[PDB]
Amino acid sequence: IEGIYEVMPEKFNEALKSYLKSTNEVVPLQDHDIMKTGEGREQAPIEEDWYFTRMASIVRQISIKGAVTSEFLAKRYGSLKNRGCRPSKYVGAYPEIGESVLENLKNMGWINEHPKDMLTEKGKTIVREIIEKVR
Amino acid sequence: NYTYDPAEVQYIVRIHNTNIDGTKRIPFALTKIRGIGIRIATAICKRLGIDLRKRAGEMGEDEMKRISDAILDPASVGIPESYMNHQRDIIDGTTSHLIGTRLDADLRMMIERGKKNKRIRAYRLDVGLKVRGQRTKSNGR
Amino acid sequence: EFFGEVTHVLGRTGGSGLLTQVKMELMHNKRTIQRAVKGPVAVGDIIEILECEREHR
Amino acid sequence: GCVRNKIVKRAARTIAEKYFQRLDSTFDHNLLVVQDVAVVQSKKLKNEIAGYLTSLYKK
Amino acid sequence: AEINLFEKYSYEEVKVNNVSLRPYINLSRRGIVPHAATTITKGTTGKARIPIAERFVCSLMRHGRNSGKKRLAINIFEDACFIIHSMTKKNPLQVLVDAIVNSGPREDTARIGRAGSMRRTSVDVSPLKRISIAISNLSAGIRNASFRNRITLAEAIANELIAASTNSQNSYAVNKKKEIERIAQSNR
Amino acid sequence: VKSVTTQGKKKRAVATCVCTQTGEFSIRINKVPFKLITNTLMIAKLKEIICIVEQANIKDLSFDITCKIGGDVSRVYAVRMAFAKAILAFYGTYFDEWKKQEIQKRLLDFDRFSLVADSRKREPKKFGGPGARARYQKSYR
Amino acid sequence: GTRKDKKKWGDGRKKEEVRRAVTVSEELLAKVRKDVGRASVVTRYMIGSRYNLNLGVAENVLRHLSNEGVVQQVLGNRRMTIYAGCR
Amino acid sequence: KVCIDMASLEEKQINKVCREFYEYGKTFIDDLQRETVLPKKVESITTLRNPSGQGTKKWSRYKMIVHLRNFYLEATHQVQFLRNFPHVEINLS
RNA sequence: GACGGUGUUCUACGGAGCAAGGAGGGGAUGGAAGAGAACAGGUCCGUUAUGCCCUGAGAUGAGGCGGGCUGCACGCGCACUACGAUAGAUGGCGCUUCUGCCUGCUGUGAGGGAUGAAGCUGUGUAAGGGGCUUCUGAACGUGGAAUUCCUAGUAAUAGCGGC
């Protein structure tokens, strides 16, 4: 959409993060308190509710590009792997975290199907409420 | 500092016959045991319900009695099966998580059971030679 | 301390071309004087001293 | 390393002896002449025959 | 529309009290950050076209685990100039020029003879060499004081300048200059 | 509609600046206004040009800059040049051009390479060593 | 033919310090409050050395008596924070 | 719609064929006596000079540069004096 | 069509330094190239290049299957990863871009990551060689005499292509 570049991207993430927790419709992974978010990591996320700050990270940029696939998401949340007595390399996130957020949004009726535009009017109307609140 | 930090702490703590340091945070302090790293110790302290941000020295007997029993079998607190260091044993077939004094007794039986059948990997592993594909001509002296 | 402005560059004569002979001209009372310096000196430069009693050549 | 070889010096003296009164004391003029008179190919060679001539002229 | 080197500190009233080092300390090229890619600083006479606050920053990206970190050295200088300001009440750009002056020697000792006539002579030092030795002693006392201690690099920079601009005997830069000068006058 | 366009390049970065004329001052690098920019080098290198050519000479322009390829410090030096050689191309056509000739003198005493392009170029690599000048380590015995 | 000088003649880890305090008692917290209010620059390192306490605890002492006390933050990075006392 | 395409390895004999066909097609059905000049194509290989393992080890890279021009002139039955050139690789589609 | 051309300071009239103007400045940059001699330098394991000797059916020829070239008391040459706060961990921002930037925890063996255990998997006729998950967690506290490479978009740091 337009106007999503005018708001500070760290306050948008906190403005529909607390909004998502107050609907009780999202269901996290099979277990998200025990796993580390990728193969190039060593320890689990320090925060307790990374799964909601991680979903609103995907919903900001589902509205910039307009269509997200389950391979760009793994490729965008990677890290540097420590390979010991060798030099390090770049690996992406688990392909399982990125698709479980593309179905929570679908069941709530936000992203439709489309490969060139993934948002319904109920999604565009909701996102436009957070833009106008954190000017 | 009204309530940010405590006023007095115990300097020593005894769990599973090892003296935990009582001035560190909880998930780090349990790594003095042998069999507990920082990646499974912080999972037990999250299913139980312990506060991650609290020194181990300041704990009642209720907590130290709970988590000292969760460490025996972690499959009862609810951690998956792919997290234990000893799955699907070759002698009976049951998964478990050996800890402390039961670690060094487990491989010491492997080396002995393998010499009766005169294996080769159990003769090299007994006198300290490299058992995986490494080349022993310039390194390892 | 004293001063002086280099006005002639005689030559570079060190153990391994390190020092460079020079001809200073004291300013509180005009007096030419020879002297050996260590850094990359040019003409017109003004060096310091802390005693002006040697000529080196 | 700005020395001029013999083929480029030996040529500028042949030019300063035959077409001498056609030359004056600016680079942009003497270059126009050596394009008229000589027949070389390299554009770097005329640029140096013309630059050596303007020094010969004011000498 | 005047330029202050971090939007707070002015370049006038930064008078260099000396007279031989004045044409060699460049407070002339101003900017609101000590970062300027140029070509006019190459050459045998381009050593006097580097700003003075840039000579001191690029002395800190050493020991090649830190090669080429110039933005991280510029960040650590914003904070050291805050401590120098609120603590001593004077211009932080003007106490760095007083340290370079009170920490560069004025005479050294050289060799002449060959193995039987090895003779410690005495020489003076031209200005441009007197600044390469000042900058290198200030930064080598800042790297020692931070290696394995619990102190931060921006506080190890502040203590080293507020002590060298007063000749306080707590500075690694000034105690190291007084051996050079005392020794260099005993061989004479 | 009054508009111009310019180009800046530093190493292999390339930027463009479209300069219209509305009645308010503004900047927008890559669609982000000039208040949420986080590059503190992009704010210090781009607001010492607004002090070397005074503010009053630009009160009613709005620049839109772009830069999509290259490193990080190089990208600044490309935005910084398309923005400076657009305050002149504007004063050449729609303003007093004797007012374009003196601020062009004020920008050149500051630095010649905020209007012209640096020509320094990366050197190739030669065999027998890891770079252009360095060689591999020799051994004498 | 024999490693005889490649062996390192060194020492045993030149002596260490005592562990630093991790508890803050009330009487010393009121001593930190004694002279921390007439200072120009106070960092978490200047505090953790006069009283010998872990530098992660030395800042919670400053955050606490910054809410109602005399100090107040004047700048903060991820690698430093300074508290200027309000005399 | 005629479309003449050229390609060859040496260039001092591709310019001749693109100038000798300049005049024998001037006074004909077509006009616009010009030929586009695309950017060349390159193929590289790098190898060792030493035919065994002795000496200093020395490398050398070879190139196969290929020039190519284009022609676009619509006519109707206007040739075989194009097929009489030794090195240029004529193409007529 | 950039020539030390113009000005300037020295010259043996061969040329050299420093300035301005300039998209480019002092062999415009980096390469490629490189007479005629020498060495008993290297290659017969590169070649249906080659003299002489050797070998000839239970062949010193041609195939197929297993083993080895990877064995390990010890001496040496080139490298990769480290010995920490100018840092490590975890998140956010940049995308078909990048090797960066901001950051709640750690105040010190949470630095380092060798060696070995149990369980899951890819290529292939054949693999405890190659990857992944939990555990184990060495030596190492910036290195003796000696010694190598380097003059600017270079040295050093962090990486991506191809063969």
Side-chain angles (χ1 to χ4, degrees), chain C residues 10-34:
Chain C
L10 298 196
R12 291 185 61 110
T13 73
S16 58
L18 183 69
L19 282 71
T20 168
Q21 200 80 32
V22 79
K23 164 163 309 173
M24 292 171 50
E25 294 285 359
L26 288 159
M27 45 186 45
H28 66 294
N29 49 347
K30 271 60 189 174
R31 268 186 293 174
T32 68
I33 191 183
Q34 285 212 61

mmCIF file of all heavy atoms in Angstrom, chain C residues 10-34:
data_model
loop_
_atom_site.group_PDB
_atom_site.id
_atom_site.type_symbol
_atom_site.label_atom_id
_atom_site.label_comp_id
_atom_site.label_asym_id
_atom_site.label_seq_id
_atom_site.Cartn_x
_atom_site.Cartn_y
_atom_site.Cartn_z
ATOM 1 N N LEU C 10 71.675 21.274 2.724
ATOM 2 C CA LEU C 10 73.001 20.892 2.251
ATOM 3 C C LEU C 10 73.001 19.495 1.644
ATOM 4 O O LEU C 10 73.408 19.307 0.493
ATOM 5 C CB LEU C 10 74.013 20.984 3.392
ATOM 6 C CG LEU C 10 74.135 22.403 3.934
ATOM 7 C CD1 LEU C 10 75.393 22.562 4.761
ATOM 8 C CD2 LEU C 10 74.094 23.389 2.795
ATOM 9 N N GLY C 11 72.571 18.497 2.403
ATOM 10 C CA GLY C 11 72.530 17.147 1.868
ATOM 11 C C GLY C 11 72.044 16.168 2.909
ATOM 12 O O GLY C 11 71.846 16.510 4.079
ATOM 13 N N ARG C 12 71.858 14.930 2.465
ATOM 14 C CA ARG C 12 71.390 13.852 3.326
ATOM 15 C C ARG C 12 72.559 12.920 3.595
ATOM 16 O O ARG C 12 72.959 12.145 2.722
ATOM 17 C CB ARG C 12 70.217 13.112 2.694
ATOM 18 C CG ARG C 12 68.966 13.961 2.627
ATOM 19 C CD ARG C 12 67.805 13.177 2.121
ATOM 20 N NE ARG C 12 67.522 12.054 2.997
ATOM 21 C CZ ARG C 12 66.454 11.981 3.775
ATOM 22 N NH1 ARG C 12 65.570 12.965 3.777
ATOM 23 N NH2 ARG C 12 66.265 10.921 4.541
ATOM 24 N N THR C 13 73.105 12.999 4.804
ATOM 25 C CA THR C 13 74.258 12.203 5.210
ATOM 26 C C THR C 13 73.928 11.569 6.554
ATOM 27 O O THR C 13 74.183 12.164 7.603
ATOM 28 C CB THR C 13 75.516 13.048 5.315
ATOM 29 O OG1 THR C 13 75.423 13.878 6.481
ATOM 30 C CG2 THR C 13 75.693 13.926 4.079
ATOM 31 N N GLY C 14 73.362 10.365 6.520
ATOM 32 C CA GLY C 14 73.173 9.564 7.705
ATOM 33 C C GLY C 14 73.814 8.201 7.520
ATOM 34 O O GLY C 14 74.454 7.925 6.504
ATOM 35 N N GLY C 15 73.623 7.350 8.526
ATOM 36 C CA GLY C 15 74.126 5.990 8.418
ATOM 37 C C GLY C 15 73.512 5.241 7.252
ATOM 38 O O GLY C 15 74.195 4.496 6.545
ATOM 39 N N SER C 16 72.216 5.442 7.032
ATOM 40 C CA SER C 16 71.491 4.829 5.934
ATOM 41 C C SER C 16 70.568 5.859 5.298
ATOM 42 O O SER C 16 69.414 5.570 4.966
ATOM 43 C CB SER C 16 70.691 3.633 6.420
ATOM 44 O OG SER C 16 69.805 4.048 7.434
ATOM 45 N N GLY C 17 71.071 7.076 5.122
ATOM 46 C CA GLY C 17 70.289 8.155 4.552
ATOM 47 C C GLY C 17 69.152 8.601 5.439
ATOM 48 O O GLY C 17 68.064 8.905 4.936
ATOM 49 N N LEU C 18 69.376 8.651 6.747
ATOM 50 C CA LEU C 18 68.331 8.936 7.718
ATOM 51 C C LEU C 18 68.277 10.405 8.104
ATOM 52 O O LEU C 18 67.217 11.031 8.033
ATOM 53 C CB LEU C 18 68.544 8.066 8.958
ATOM 54 C CG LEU C 18 67.499 8.175 10.058
ATOM 55 C CD1 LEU C 18 66.197 7.575 9.598
ATOM 56 C CD2 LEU C 18 67.992 7.437 11.275
ATOM 57 N N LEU C 19 69.409 10.958 8.517
ATOM 58 C CA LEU C 19 69.528 12.356 8.878
ATOM 59 C C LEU C 19 69.712 13.207 7.627
ATOM 60 O O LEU C 19 69.933 12.704 6.528
ATOM 61 C CB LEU C 19 70.704 12.555 9.824
ATOM 62 C CG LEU C 19 70.493 12.158 11.278
ATOM 63 C CD1 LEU C 19 70.412 10.670 11.424
ATOM 64 C CD2 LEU C 19 71.628 12.683 12.103
ATOM 65 N N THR C 20 69.620 14.519 7.805
ATOM 66 C CA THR C 20 69.799 15.453 6.702
ATOM 67 C C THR C 20 70.425 16.732 7.231
ATOM 68 O O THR C 20 69.842 17.400 8.088
ATOM 69 C CB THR C 20 68.473 15.748 6.005
ATOM 70 O OG1 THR C 20 68.638 16.862 5.125
ATOM 71 C CG2 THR C 20 67.392 16.051 7.005
ATOM 72 N N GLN C 21 71.614 17.053 6.739
ATOM 73 C CA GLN C 21 72.272 18.289 7.120
ATOM 74 C C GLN C 21 71.486 19.495 6.615
ATOM 75 O O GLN C 21 70.787 19.428 5.603
ATOM 76 C CB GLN C 21 73.660 18.371 6.536
ATOM 77 C CG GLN C 21 74.634 19.329 7.182
ATOM 78 C CD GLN C 21 75.277 18.832 8.427
ATOM 79 O OE1 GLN C 21 75.497 17.626 8.550
ATOM 80 N NE2 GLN C 21 75.778 19.734 9.257
ATOM 81 N N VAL C 22 71.611 20.615 7.324
ATOM 82 C CA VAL C 22 70.787 21.783 7.042
ATOM 83 C C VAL C 22 71.491 23.004 7.601
ATOM 84 O O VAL C 22 72.408 22.892 8.413
ATOM 85 C CB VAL C 22 69.377 21.623 7.658
ATOM 86 C CG1 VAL C 22 69.427 21.932 9.133
ATOM 87 C CG2 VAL C 22 68.398 22.500 6.950
ATOM 88 N N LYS C 23 71.056 24.187 7.168
ATOM 89 C CA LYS C 23 71.668 25.441 7.600
ATOM 90 C C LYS C 23 70.574 26.359 8.138
ATOM 91 O O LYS C 23 69.859 27.005 7.369
ATOM 92 C CB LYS C 23 72.441 26.084 6.463
ATOM 93 C CG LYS C 23 72.791 27.513 6.666
ATOM 94 C CD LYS C 23 73.888 27.999 5.742
ATOM 95 C CE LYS C 23 75.113 27.120 5.735
ATOM 96 N NZ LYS C 23 76.091 27.550 4.701
ATOM 97 N N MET C 24 70.443 26.413 9.459
ATOM 98 C CA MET C 24 69.443 27.232 10.123
ATOM 99 C C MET C 24 69.841 28.689 10.225
ATOM 100 O O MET C 24 70.969 29.071 9.922
ATOM 101 C CB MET C 24 69.093 26.678 11.499
ATOM 102 C CG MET C 24 68.369 25.363 11.490
ATOM 103 S SD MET C 24 68.225 24.678 13.137
ATOM 104 C CE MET C 24 67.588 26.094 14.018
ATOM 105 N N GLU C 25 68.882 29.519 10.676
ATOM 106 C CA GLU C 25 69.139 30.959 10.797
ATOM 107 C C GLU C 25 68.322 31.411 12.015
ATOM 108 O O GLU C 25 67.126 31.705 11.889
ATOM 109 C CB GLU C 25 68.657 31.667 9.532
ATOM 110 C CG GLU C 25 69.467 31.270 8.302
ATOM 111 C CD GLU C 25 70.836 31.857 8.187
ATOM 112 O OE1 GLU C 25 71.220 32.630 9.080
ATOM 113 O OE2 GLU C 25 71.594 31.428 7.283
ATOM 114 N N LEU C 26 68.969 31.467 13.179
ATOM 115 C CA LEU C 26 68.303 31.844 14.427
ATOM 116 C C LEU C 26 67.632 33.201 14.281
ATOM 117 O O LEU C 26 68.049 34.041 13.478
ATOM 118 C CB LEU C 26 69.342 31.889 15.543
ATOM 119 C CG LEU C 26 69.862 30.534 16.010
ATOM 120 C CD1 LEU C 26 71.196 30.726 16.693
ATOM 121 C CD2 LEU C 26 68.887 29.917 17.000
ATOM 122 N N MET C 27 66.571 33.415 15.067
ATOM 123 C CA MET C 27 65.728 34.571 14.818
ATOM 124 C C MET C 27 65.800 35.620 15.931
ATOM 125 O O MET C 27 65.648 36.807 15.642
ATOM 126 C CB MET C 27 64.255 34.173 14.688
ATOM 127 C CG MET C 27 63.757 33.200 15.715
ATOM 128 S SD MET C 27 62.075 32.693 15.342
ATOM 129 C CE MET C 27 62.215 32.389 13.588
ATOM 130 N N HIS C 28 66.004 35.231 17.192
ATOM 131 C CA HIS C 28 66.129 36.241 18.241
ATOM 132 C C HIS C 28 67.379 37.090 18.066
ATOM 133 O O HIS C 28 67.396 38.253 18.483
ATOM 134 C CB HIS C 28 66.077 35.571 19.611
ATOM 135 C CG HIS C 28 67.236 34.669 19.883
ATOM 136 N ND1 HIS C 28 67.446 33.514 19.161
ATOM 137 C CD2 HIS C 28 68.214 34.712 20.817
ATOM 138 C CE1 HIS C 28 68.519 32.898 19.619
ATOM 139 N NE2 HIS C 28 69.005 33.605 20.626
ATOM 140 N N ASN C 29 68.417 36.536 17.451
ATOM 141 C CA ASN C 29 69.567 37.321 17.014
ATOM 142 C C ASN C 29 70.186 36.594 15.834
ATOM 143 O O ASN C 29 70.681 35.472 15.990
ATOM 144 C CB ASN C 29 70.580 37.507 18.142
ATOM 145 C CG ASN C 29 70.919 36.212 18.834
ATOM 146 O OD1 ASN C 29 70.244 35.205 18.648
ATOM 147 N ND2 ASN C 29 71.972 36.230 19.640
ATOM 148 N N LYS C 30 70.157 37.231 14.664
ATOM 149 C CA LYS C 30 70.446 36.554 13.403
ATOM 150 C C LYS C 30 71.833 35.934 13.406
ATOM 151 O O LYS C 30 72.830 36.626 13.646
ATOM 152 C CB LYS C 30 70.303 37.542 12.246
ATOM 153 C CG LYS C 30 68.899 37.607 11.676
ATOM 154 C CD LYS C 30 67.891 38.028 12.731
ATOM 155 C CE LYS C 30 66.465 37.875 12.229
ATOM 156 N NZ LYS C 30 65.473 38.138 13.306
ATOM 157 N N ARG C 31 71.892 34.623 13.150
ATOM 158 C CA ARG C 31 73.177 33.931 13.114
ATOM 159 C C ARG C 31 72.981 32.650 12.313
ATOM 160 O O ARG C 31 72.183 31.788 12.706
ATOM 161 C CB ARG C 31 73.637 33.597 14.528
ATOM 162 C CG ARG C 31 74.515 34.661 15.161
ATOM 163 C CD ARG C 31 75.051 34.174 16.494
ATOM 164 N NE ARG C 31 73.990 34.018 17.487
ATOM 165 C CZ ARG C 31 74.170 33.504 18.700
ATOM 166 N NH1 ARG C 31 75.377 33.114 19.086
ATOM 167 N NH2 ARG C 31 73.141 33.378 19.527
ATOM 168 N N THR C 32 73.712 32.513 11.211
ATOM 169 C CA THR C 32 73.677 31.260 10.479
ATOM 170 C C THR C 32 74.335 30.193 11.364
ATOM 171 O O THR C 32 75.199 30.488 12.199
ATOM 172 C CB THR C 32 74.469 31.330 9.179
ATOM 173 O OG1 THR C 32 75.863 31.454 9.463
ATOM 174 C CG2 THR C 32 74.070 32.628 8.444
ATOM 175 N N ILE C 33 73.923 28.945 11.179
ATOM 176 C CA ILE C 33 74.424 27.856 12.006
ATOM 177 C C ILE C 33 74.089 26.547 11.311
ATOM 178 O O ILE C 33 72.988 26.376 10.781
ATOM 179 C CB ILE C 33 73.819 27.925 13.426
ATOM 180 C CG1 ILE C 33 74.528 26.957 14.365
ATOM 181 C CG2 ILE C 33 72.338 27.619 13.390
ATOM 182 C CD1 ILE C 33 73.923 26.925 15.748
ATOM 183 N N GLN C 34 75.041 25.628 11.312
ATOM 184 C CA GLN C 34 74.781 24.316 10.747
ATOM 185 C C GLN C 34 74.170 23.406 11.801
ATOM 186 O O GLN C 34 74.327 23.612 13.004
ATOM 187 C CB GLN C 34 76.053 23.693 10.183
ATOM 188 C CG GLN C 34 76.487 24.292 8.867
ATOM 189 C CD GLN C 34 77.174 23.278 7.981
ATOM 190 O OE1 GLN C 34 76.583 22.268 7.609
ATOM 191 N NE2 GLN C 34 78.425 23.543 7.638
#
